[PDB]
Amino acid sequence: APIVHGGGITEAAARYGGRPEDWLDLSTGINPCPVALPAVPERAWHRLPDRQTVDDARSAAADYYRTNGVLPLPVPGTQSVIQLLPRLAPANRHVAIFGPTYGEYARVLEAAGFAVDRVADADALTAEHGLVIVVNPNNPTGRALAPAELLAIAARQKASGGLLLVDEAFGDLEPQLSVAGHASGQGNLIVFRSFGKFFGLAGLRLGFVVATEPVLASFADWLGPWAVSGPALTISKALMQGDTKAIAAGILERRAGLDAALDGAGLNRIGGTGLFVLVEHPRAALLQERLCEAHILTRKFDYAPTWLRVGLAPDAAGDRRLADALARMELLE
Amino acid sequence: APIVHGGGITEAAARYGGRPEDWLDLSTGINPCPVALPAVPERAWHRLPDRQTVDDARSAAADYYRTNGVLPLPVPGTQSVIQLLPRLAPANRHVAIFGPTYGEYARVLEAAGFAVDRVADADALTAEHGLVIVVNPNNPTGRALAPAELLAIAARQKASGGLLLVDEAFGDLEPQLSVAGHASGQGNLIVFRSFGKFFGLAGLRLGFVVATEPVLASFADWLGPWAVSGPALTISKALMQGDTKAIAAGILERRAGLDAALDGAGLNRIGGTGLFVLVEHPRAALLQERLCEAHILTRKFDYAPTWLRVGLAPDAAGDRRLADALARMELLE
Ligand SMILES: Cc1ncc(COP(=O)(O)O)c(CNC[C@@H](C)OP(=O)(O)O)c1O
Numbered sequence: 315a316p317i318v319h320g321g322g323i324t325e326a327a328a329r330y331g332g333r334p335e336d337w338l339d340l341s342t343g344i345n346p347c348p349v350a351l352p353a354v355p356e357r358a359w360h361r362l363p364d365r366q367t368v369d370d371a372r373s374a375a376a377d378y379y380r381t382n383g384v385l386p387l388p389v390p391g392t393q394s395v396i397q398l399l400p401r402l403a404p405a406n407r408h409v410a411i412f413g414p415t416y417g418e419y420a421r422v423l424e425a426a427g428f429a430v431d432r433v434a435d436a437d438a439l440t441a442e443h444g445l446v447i448v449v450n451p452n453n454p455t456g457r458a459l460a461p462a463e464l465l466a467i468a469a470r471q472k473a474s475g476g477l478l479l480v481d482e483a484f485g486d487l488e489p490q491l492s493v494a495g496h497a498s499g500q501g502n503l504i505v506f507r508s509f510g511k512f513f514g515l516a517g518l519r520l521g522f523v524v525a526t527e528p529v530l531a532s533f534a535d536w537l538g539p540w541a542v543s544g545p546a547l548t549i550s551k552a553l554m555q556g557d558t559k560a561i562a563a564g565i566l567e568r569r570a571g572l573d574a575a576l577d578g579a580g581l582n583r584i585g586g587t588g589l590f591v592l593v594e595h596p597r598a599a600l601l602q603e604r605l606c607e608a609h610i611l612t613r614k615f616d617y618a619p620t621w622l623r624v625g626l627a628p629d630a631a632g633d634r635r636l637a638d639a640l641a642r643m644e645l646l647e
Numbered sequence: 648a649p650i651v652h653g654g655g656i657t658e659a660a661a662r663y664g665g666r667p668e669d670w671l672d673l674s675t676g677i678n679p680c681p682v683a684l685p686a687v688p689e690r691a692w693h694r695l696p697d698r699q700t701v702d703d704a705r706s707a708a709a710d711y712y713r714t715n716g717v718l719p720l721p722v723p724g725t726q727s728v729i730q731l732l733p734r735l736a737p738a739n740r741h742v743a744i745f746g747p748t749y750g751e752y753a754r755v756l757e758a759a760g761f762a763v764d765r766v767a768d769a770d771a772l773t774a775e776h777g778l779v780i781v782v783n784p785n786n787p788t789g790r791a792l793a794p795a796e797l798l799a800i801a802a803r804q805k806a807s808g809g810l811l812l813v814d815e816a817f818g819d820l821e822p823q824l825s826v827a828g829h830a831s832g833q834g835n836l837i838v839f840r841s842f843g844k845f846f847g848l849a850g851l852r853l854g855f856v857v858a859t860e861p862v863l864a865s866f867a868d869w870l871g872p873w874a875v876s877g878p879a880l881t882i883s884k885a886l887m888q889g890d891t892k893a894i895a896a897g898i899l900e901r902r903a904g905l906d907a908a909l910d911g912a913g914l915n916r917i918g919g920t921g922l923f924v925l926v927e928h929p930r931a932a933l934l935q936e937r938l939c940e941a942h943i944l945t946r947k948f949d950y951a952p953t954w955l956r957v958g959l960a961p962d963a964a965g966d967r968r969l970a971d972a973l974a975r976m977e978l979l980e
Pocket residue numbers: 318319320321341342343390391392393394416417449453481483484507508509510516519520521613
């Protein structure tokens with residue numbers, strides 16, 4: 315069975331009742347206040363995506379991610395290039411994953427016959443690891459390695475022909491943590507960027523890969539022609555060239571609202587990012603179920619029974635709705 | 648180097664001059680008159696695509712393709728599941744492709760180490776062929792096998808555990824040719840459907856797979872979560888439930904316009920579908936180049952130097968623009 319990711323409002327409503335639009339979905343890390351849609355000309359809807367449409371999105375992404383001249387490859391969601399890591403990871407070597415983290419990396423790689431080593435820090439890394447994977451900042455804990463630590467990991471693995479993959483899906487709010495500007499100088503470094511979370515348009519399937527040209531050419535060939543939609547490439551070019559400072563500011567305001575609601579309910583926050591909070595509670599799974607009975611979806615983890623990941627609400631009313639559900643919740647037994 | 652597919656207006660304009668919007672693109676088989684966009688609610692843009700959004704598109708596609716109860720799997724363009732045929736095609740067996748045809752099948756499968764046999768009819772098919780691929784009606788010749796011939800091919804290959812793939816990307820105009828209703832009864836039959844060509848929204852990346860549940864479950868796992876965008880699934884549900892009779896009627900009117908322009912220019916039409924024409928001319932490659940100098944893009948083929956595939960123009964003015972370019976063209980030497 316596939317991983318039960320956040321966002322499962324359809325399945326939650328079927329089990330707990332209510333209309334999907336009446337649920338408060340706090341089970342993802344998506345910006346709850348989507349940016350206004352830019353114009354998408356009819357040409358972008360009608361035609362197979364043109365090289366010019368691709369190139370403009372790549373140029374905007376290079377400026378936006380500060381890639382020091384590397385033109386990022388647009389991909390139809392970073393999930394699509396996660397599915398392709400078996401073709402890149404050095405054959406007959408282990409993969410080390412800084413965890414616990416987003417589950418698709420281990421799922422995809424183990425399904426392809428790779429041996430996956432769960433690690434918590436760099437001192438566990440060896441020459442047996444053909445690929446090292448860091449989600450930075452981490453999903454779901456928010457742990458952030460400094461760029462210098464990431465580059466030291468890369469340099470150490472490079473000696474044995476190992477690669478370092480840094481998934482910066484949740485890194486837009488802290489661009490000073492990014493190593494997306496180091497692809498050419500490091501040589502063995504790959505960076506995934508995700509478009510949906512920060513901009514709040516996760517209905518679009520769009521990410522970007524920053525890497526050396528031989529690696530980008532490989533991903534491009536594996537994905538095949540017309541991999542990313544015309545509308546997605548049009549929208550990302552416009553939004554990345556707009557005022558992203560105001561996007562970050564709005565997110566931090568909603569994060570302050572979530573902090574106040576969770577702290578005021580007596581919950582213990584142990585980590586997170588601008589876009590979600592990790593709560594630790596001895597009955598986290600029962601909290602998740604009781605919140606579902608209030609038609610509020612949050613994210614629980616089968617590997618961490620005391621963990622609850624709570625995303626941002628869209629406004630102060632939603633903050634208050636969360637707080638009231640916690641305050642009026644029935645016995646946790 | 649990747650195949651030079653039709654649609655390369657960016658590259659054509661850079662070589663031959665002109666602004667891309669001033670070119671007449673007759674190098675694809677896309678409906679030149681895109682349907683009006685249905686409403687796409689903000690929810691569909693904002694959220695990761697929900698199971699309910701997927702299921703509604705699958706139900707609409709089952710009705711639209713007349714799949715006899717099979718719910719088609721939405722995929723982000725049929726190119727995405729072509730890239731995945733190596734995982735489905737029986738290992739250590741040959742693949743037979745009815746050709747000459749769309750080039751990505753042989754490109755993908757040979758890159759994966761499969762032996763590909765080009766065939767022209769069923770009498771060349773043997774038990775050595777683990778997979779047989781028919782594009783029906785064919786791109787670029789328009790050749791159409793009858794459903795009974797396709798099912799006879801399927802039944803014959805089934806005896807040796809062989810599969811039959813029918814790509815009906817260009818089949819919407821002739822639904823009576825489709826075998827999309829035979830997945831359950833045939834058992835070894837897979838059908839690809841493409842959304843962009845008939846509806847004229849090729850900026851969206853959307854197709855559908857009709858097959859038995861074990862095969863659909865395999866494709867779904869290989870593609871991973873959230874493979875198809877929210878907007879694409881919203882738009883296809885609405886358009887498939889609308890008046891598609893009027894879409895077909897408009898296409899045939901533009902096809903009549905193209906026929907008149909090509910016949911009146913003295914060109915020999917040797918095949919096609921409602922959405923494109925195959926012309927045979929002893930200097931086809933030079934015709935393509937001269938049309939480019941008039942900023943009209945058509946499709947030539949490196950394997951067939953006397954073939955020229957011409958797509959529909961958007962209106963009668965474009966028909967006349969094509970005719971005038973042929974009439975005023977300089978020496979073909
Ligand atoms: C770290 C990370 N990397 C990549 C992706 C893929 O995003 P995209 O394909 O849109 O670029 C996700 C999505 N994570 C989505 C989230 C709902 O899943 P969980 O509840 O399992 O954490 C992610 O969390």
